[PDB]
Design a protein around this ligand. Structure first.
Ligand SMILES: CC(C)(C)NC(=O)[C@@H]1C[C@@H]2CCCC[C@@H]2CN1C[C@@H](O)[C@H](Cc1ccccc1)NC(=O)[C@H](CC(N)=O)NC(=O)c1ccc2ccccc2n1
Length: 330
């Protein structure tokens, strides 16, 4: 089997991407943020504290003839910015772009933090990291991909995120028309439960490539590109007026600037992020100071190849016995 679903930016800045997911019988379609950095499929629901729902579409398990309460199971998760959610668990039929998994754990939110409430466009998350990170207790549950894998034509999924445009998540096949040149595969460590890999270096604009190992994770659930302070300083030094602002919380730059590209290495291959991809717009409405799309990972404890990087590539998440990651230009 295969599946193919369009993923759409939630706003004009590509702050995140949402993908329609069918849950239950009859289908209830929710727009979920596919997150290769986490391993829980959770949704706003009829069980979510009423005051914490503000425009999201909810899953109502009582209206699904295939929903079954997973007895005694609960979940609770906290993300990189301290946002959080928790609740109970059902199993139900879940379909993505024509690919169907029966008995998928659907984690129904009883509580969500303010950041989730305040974002009406995201109805929940669909985790695509390794199932070892799933938070369901006392019996850990499998991700959608892990459940589907055996049925897939090939044990892979691909992320093809758009710049200011929709893109595609495919399951079970590689669309050879969706990229240019070849796909370069690179080793993955699953020790921390992430799609963790090592970039071979970087360049800023038309500058010389610096060969240096940068360990990081491919995280579609993170908007920006977080890299070591040395690398980030070298990038922003090429932008007149750019500065790291403690008050704003990172590098900002004059909105009048034309940004240089940023290149990262995948083995001997090179992925070029155009400068425009690195502009996240005014820091506050009407400001002429803009927020940068490349930020320091210092104090995070890990580098993050988030959407800013991933959207410049066609990315293969290879879930074979020994997982690997593939990157192609597009
Ligand atoms: C939960 C856990 C399993 C630990 N996985 C993680 O926390 C993973 C994996 C790594 C863990 C160690 C630290 C680095 C990454 C962070 N990621 C965070 C990853 O799972 C999570 C998914 C998510 C999506 C939507 C809304 C909330 C949360 N993204 C995040 O925590 C980051 C935080 C940030 N500001 O960088 N969220 C965003 O980049 C983000 C999401 C939505 C937005 C909407 C509008 C405007 C900006 C937006 N920014």
């Amino acid at each position: 089997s295969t599946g193919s679903a369009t993923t759409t930016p939630i706003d004009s800045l590509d702050d995140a991407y949402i993908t329609p997911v069918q849950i239950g019988t009859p289908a209830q379609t929710l727009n979920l943020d596919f997150d290769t950095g986490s391993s829980d499929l959770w949704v706003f629901s009829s069980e979510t504290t009423a005051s914490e729902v503000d425009g999201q579409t909810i899953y109502t398990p009582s209206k699904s003839t295939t929903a079954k309460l997973l007895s005694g199971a609960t979940w609770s998760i906290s993300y990189g910015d301290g946002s959080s959610s928790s609740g109970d668990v059902y199993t139900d039929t879940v379909s993505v772009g024509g690919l169907t998994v029966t008995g998928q754990a659907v984690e129904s939110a009883k509580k969500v933090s303010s950041s989730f409430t305040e974002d009406s466009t995201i109805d929940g998350l669909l985790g695509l990291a390794f199932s070892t990170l799933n938070t369901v207790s006392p019996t850990q549950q499998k991700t959608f991909f892990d459940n589907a894998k055996a049925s897939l034509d090939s044990p892979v999924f691909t992320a093809d995120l758009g710049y200011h445009a929709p893109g595609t998540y495919n399951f079970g096949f590689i669309d050879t028309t969706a990229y240019t040149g070849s796909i370069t595969y690179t080793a993955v460590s699953t020790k921390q439960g992430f799609w963790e890999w090592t970039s071979t270096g970087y360049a800023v604009g038309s500058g010389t490539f610096k060969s240096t190992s940068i360990d990081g994770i491919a995280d579609t659930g993170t908007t920006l590109l977080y890299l070591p302070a040395t690398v980030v300083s070298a990038y922003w030094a090429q932008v007149s007026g750019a500065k790291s602002s403690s008050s704003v919380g990172g590098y900002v730059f004059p909105c009048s600037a034309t940004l240089p590209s940023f290149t990262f290495g995948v083995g001997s291959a090179r992925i070029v992020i155009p400068g425009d991809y690195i502009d996240f717009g005014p820091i506050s409405t009407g400001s002429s100071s803009c927020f940068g799309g490349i930020q320091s990972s210092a104090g995070i404890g890990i580098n993050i190849f988030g959407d800013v990087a991933l959207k410049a590539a066609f990315v293969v998440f290879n879930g074979a016995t020994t997982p690997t990651l593939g990157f192609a230009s597009k």
